[PDB]
Amino acid sequence: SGGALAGDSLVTLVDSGLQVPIKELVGKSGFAVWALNEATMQLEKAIVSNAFSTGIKPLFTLTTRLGRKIRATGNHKFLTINGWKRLDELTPKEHLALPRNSGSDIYWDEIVSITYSGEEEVFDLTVPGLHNFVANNIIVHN
Ligand SMILES: [Cl-]
Ligand SMILES: [Cl-]
Ligand SMILES: [Cl-]
Numbered sequence: 001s002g003g004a005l006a007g008d009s010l011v012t013l014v015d016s017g018l019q020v021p022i023k024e025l026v027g028k029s030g031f032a033v034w035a036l037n038e039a040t041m042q043l044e045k046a047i048v049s050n051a052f053s054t055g056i057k058p059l060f061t062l063t064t065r066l067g068r069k070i071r072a073t074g075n076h077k078f079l080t081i082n083g084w085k086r087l088d089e090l091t092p093k094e095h096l097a098l099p100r101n102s103g104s105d106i107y108w109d110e111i112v113s114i115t116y117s118g119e120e121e122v123f124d125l126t127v128p129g130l131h132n133f134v135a136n137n138i139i140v141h142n
């Protein structure tokens, strides 16, 4: 529930640092990825309790000014300076929270494009602590 991501969306397994397509994690649990602690605004290790397909749904490709890109359902939420917002409520030039290249801080990158990009099978992770995770180096909410 809450939206989903293209199967090739990459999540980072904390200990190995291996970037893995979310589709490959289906059925796995009890492993850590990166997530945002919104109180500290710092990245933290977060346990995933479930990884699953939600079926075939419409996807939108969102691209940022730094060149980060993700394909998500219209209802998937991203973090703006004014709170979490559905992809299909985001506007051109609106900024989203993204992890910095190094360290545990975030930066607010500008959206340069949102484009409908067809239907595919889509996937999600449940993160029972922080309810969000990093995918394709962008913070997304459950
Ligand atoms: Cl678990
Ligand atoms: Cl379906
Ligand atoms: Cl909806």
Ligand SMILES: [Cl-]
Binding pocket: 084, 085, 086, 089
């Ligand atoms: Cl919204």
Ligand code: NA
Binding pocket: 014, 015, 016, 017
């Ligand atoms: Na490591």
Ligand code: NA
Binding pocket: 081, 082, 083
């Ligand atoms: Na604010």
Ligand code: NA
Binding pocket: 091, 092, 093, 094
């Ligand atoms: Na705007």
